[model samples]
Target: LNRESVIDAALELLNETGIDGLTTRKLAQKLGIEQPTLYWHVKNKRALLDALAVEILARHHDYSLPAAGESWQSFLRNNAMSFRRALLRYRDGAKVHLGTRPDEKQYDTVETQLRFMTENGFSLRDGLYAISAVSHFTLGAVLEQQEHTAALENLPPLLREALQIMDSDDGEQAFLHGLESLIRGFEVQLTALLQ
Candidate 1:
């Protein structure tokens, strides 16, 4: 099968059963081909998943970021949120993507982020660290939300406990709920540096 066709079929299976459910046998059946034929296009499941990671991220990410002069902190936060939403889109999509670091040849998101951060005054080392921090926050939040979503049936206990801690008239609070705080810290640092 052609690359596009293979990607389409894989995406369908990915949605239906997540990364665990993906396999050459199922894809072969879906494509009306033998497993060997499928293997010809992709060496193995890891290769296919690598392709899926690129396909999924490209499909969901917006390359056009906010223009300069806006709050860089806001831009960072929005970028992180956008990535989180993209990962949370498919079944176990985050788990698959997060299993390994994004391979440089296979992914462009990291490069784009590094360039943005550097242009915005972060040194290369600081840019990498900043990206890592934002990524960790995004993934952590997504995983937490995913667990909450999956645990709906047992919501009683979780909800009771969450409410007990953070249920103000405003809303429920959460651990690691400091995304904005991180952004604010970045801004203060930036301001101090400029001064």
Candidate 2:
């Protein structure tokens, strides 16, 4: 099978076994191939995990790049929303994406994103900063929600109570607002820098 098919199987196994439980042996077993053949597709567990993370974004993030007439604020909100959806798609999904290695396949996409920001009146540094902040925020949003939901026990009474609120409809609305707040903050920056 091709690399894409191998990754597809790995994704299924990941959903079945989760990020921590996934291993080369189990993956090969799922694919009905031996370990050596699996190795030909993926070097090892680390590489496979990284690939899965990248694939999550590629397959599910619907609004990675901006549209022709879309404002940066609009794009940021869309990007953040789609990124959050992608991370939350699988079990232990955030764990799969926590520390992905850089992938060459993303070079062109990132370059285009940066150029889009620059053309939209962001300094290169600010553009990168905006992008980085959005990514960090989305990652943290998923991780925080998942961790709190997973580990409700052994927490203080107030902390546990707070989680109840945070896991409520209130918290979901707040997450959307928070993403908007970040974009608005960046808008203020852009206003201060530009006319």
Candidate 3:
């Protein structure tokens, strides 16, 4: 009936069919509306997907800014985790976000994110770089969670055992370990710049 309803339905369908499978026709069918009617709201499947990607962050990426007295290191780590959570929510969560632009709503969110970094200590350019790096890294981390079971069987024993070890530990720990290293690397660099 409304734009929110359309976006909501798309997310539900995304969970079922994923980004590759999601289509404007399929969305209209799910909504029990004619395909042309769906076009009244979204121009095409690309536009609809753009909206879906925006909504994914608008609805779930709550750690957009740092808390009072929040250390930049802590904030960046939390921000990465929050982003990873958002990406893992849907079937092709990361794929939906693969190349979505910062729509109207996201501009304000990212501004605050940049402001927080610049206000802390980073030059505006460095702040942008820091935020961009964290976001890209988190995206890579989530995208790595693809189903690799069939490929695992084709691997040699040592490689298979190493991968099994990684999987058995359930990916989050390594994600955190990687995050820690990223933040620490930034810290050392920032410190060197200071001293």
Candidate 4:
């Protein structure tokens, strides 16, 4: 009936049936309305998806960056970890987030990251690159992690045995290892620039 109600239904539909399965028609059905009624609120599928992205992100209020004197490494690590957690909160969350346009709030979050990076010794361009690197990496990582978990049960016996080694480790530990390695790579870049 309303925008918030529509977004809520869409998110529920997304959880029940992933991004692919979520359709305007299905969403309307879930909300017990005619498909045309959905059009009254959202212009198209892309608009609805963008709304969903913003709604999901709105659930997390503390996107604050590192404080004064905080190491850039620590800031980047915490930011990356926090983002990964957000992406993992919903089914196909990364896909939803990556597909959406940057709303005002998302832009504000980026501005904070850019300011933090500039304050920490990066040129504006390098700061953008650093943030882009972490953002892209986190999205890809969560997408792959979700896909791998979904496919694990269907994999052949031999592949399952091979994957079990990875499965033995905590998912969060693996994510942190990869995230820290990425931060270290950026640190090397930062060092070279300083030199």
Candidate 5:
């Protein structure tokens, strides 16, 4: 198949086989070609995975700016929620995302968030940190959630109970709590800076 088709097949394979099980050999077989043929489309396994990661991130956000009159808090929260949703869309999505380099195409999304924060009174450096803080927390939180869910059966009784506490309100309540706390923390800091 072609490069685009190869990437599509690889992503589908990711869902079926996970990052651990995804291999050029398997991808080639899925595409009905020899392993060497995959090289024509991607230089190597890492390149293939990088392409998949870029595709996934590309689909993560629409990079929309805040609506007229939308508060910075609401805008940031909506974007964070959207990012988490995208991460949860595929099996091992966080793992796939954690493994690859950030795509250049996604840079605009970051710039948009940074600009939004700066326009709302945060310094440029604080704006950068603000976006980074949100992104880092979102990624780590989703990764932990996905891993916990996968290991639910293997967890000790006490740990399972802890997760249950977190999951009691439909699995995302705890994440939302932490997200809001983080945003508030930033808000407090920004407020102090302005005053």
Candidate 6:
């Protein structure tokens, strides 16, 4: 099978069973193929999932921002938000993607971010640092939201109630709020350091 066919099968299984539930055996069964047949296209289940992650990010990336005009901070914020939304669309998506080391293909979005930083007068090292800061913040925010989501659904009543007391708003709000705060903080730090 071609890459597209392999990706399609993986996505189908992902939507139905999520990352943890997906296995080579289940994929072969779902695709009406033998295990070796599936392996012929993808080396293993992890490879298939990585393809799915690439597909997810590629599909969700919004390339509408003007090549010029937007501040670097705005550019970074938009990219980060888009990434989080894409990952949150699939169960265990963030965990799966973050578990892997950064590959060249995975750097597509990061490259876009680096371009924005470079264009806005950040040095190469600063561009890389900016990417790291935004990416680290984005991953932490996503993981926190995922944990809260899992907890709200699966926690025992007593614990859930106690957790609910800690919540004055929905988890998404907290996540978004934290993201915005981080962006503003970056702006502050960047100006202080760069200026």
Candidate 3: which stretches are off by over 4 Å? Answer: 147-154
lDDT of each: 0.71, 0.83, 0.82, 0.81, 0.81, 0.72
RMSD of each: 4.4, 2.7, 2.4, 3.1, 2.7, 4.0
Q: Estimate the overall C-alpha local distance difference test score of candidate 2.
A: 0.83
Residue pairs with clashing backbones, model 2: none
For residues 65-152, what per-residue lDDT tens digits would candidate 3 score against the true structure?
7899998899999999998898788777787788677677567777888888877788889888887888887787777774431123
Candidate 5 C-alpha lDDT tens digits along 1-195: 579999999889988877778888998899988998788888888888788877776767553467777788888788788788877877778888888887776577567767887788888998788777887998998898788666526999999998679787535988798789988998899779778
Q: State in Å the error of residue 32, model 4.
A: 2.1
* Candidate with more favorable, higher TM-score: 4 or 5: 5
lDDT per residue for candidate 4 within 100-179, as digits (tens), equals 87787557667877888888889999888887888787788888777766542599998998677667752667778778
Against the true structure, whose TM-score is highest?
3
Q: Pick the candidate with the highest lDDT.
A: 2
Residue-level lDDT tens digits of model 2 in 1-195: 788889998889877767766877887788888888987888777887888898988889878789999988888888888988898887667888886777788798889889989988998999999999988888888887766655525999999987677767525776897898889899888898876
Residue-by-residue lDDT tens digits, candidate 6, 31-75? 778878886787776777678877877777564243568877777
Scored against the true structure, residue 143 in model 4 reaches a CA lDDT of 87
Question: What TM-score, over all chains together, does every model reach?
Answer: 0.77, 0.86, 0.89, 0.84, 0.88, 0.79
Q: Lowest lDDT 10-mer window, candidate 6?
A: 59-68
Error of 5 at 108 (Å): 3.2
Number of the candidate with higher TM-score, 5 or 6: 5
lDDT of 4: 0.81
Better of 2 and 5 by lDDT: 2
